[PDB]
């Protein structure tokens, strides 16, 4: 049955709660928080980044794939740019911190 089959693709299509948790609370945490967040980002971008070497493709590129590769490839490429999203605002809040601690110092970065 297609209803079966596609409820069991879907529902095991799934982030770690934990991590869009942590993700949603950019904007609150410390930078330290934010620094720990930043590499565990990195290592999901890893696991994504192995799978795809395995499909022997990169992340802008048009033997034959299959139906199935193409599902897995747009799937982890979607992953990879909405997680390249995440951590991008990271860096960015996080340059916001460290521009106010500058400011609190009087000093500016070297730059």
Not at 57 to 73: F, K, N
């Amino acid at each position: 049955m297609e209803e079966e089959e596609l409820s069991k693709l879907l529902a095991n299509v799934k982030i770690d709660p934990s991590l869009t948790s942590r993700i949603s609370q950019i904007d609150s945490f410390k930078l330290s928080e934010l620094m720990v967040l930043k590499t565990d980002i990195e290592t999901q971008l890893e696991a994504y980044f192995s799978v795809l070497e395995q499909q022997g493709i990169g992340m802008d590129s048009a033997y034959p794939r299959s139906d199935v590769d193409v599902l897995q490839v747009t799937m982890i490429r979607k992953n990879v740019n909405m997680l390249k999203n995440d951590l991008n605002h990271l860096l960015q809040r996080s340059h916001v911190l460290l521009n106010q601690h500058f400011d609190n110092m009087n000093v500016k970065s070297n730059q």
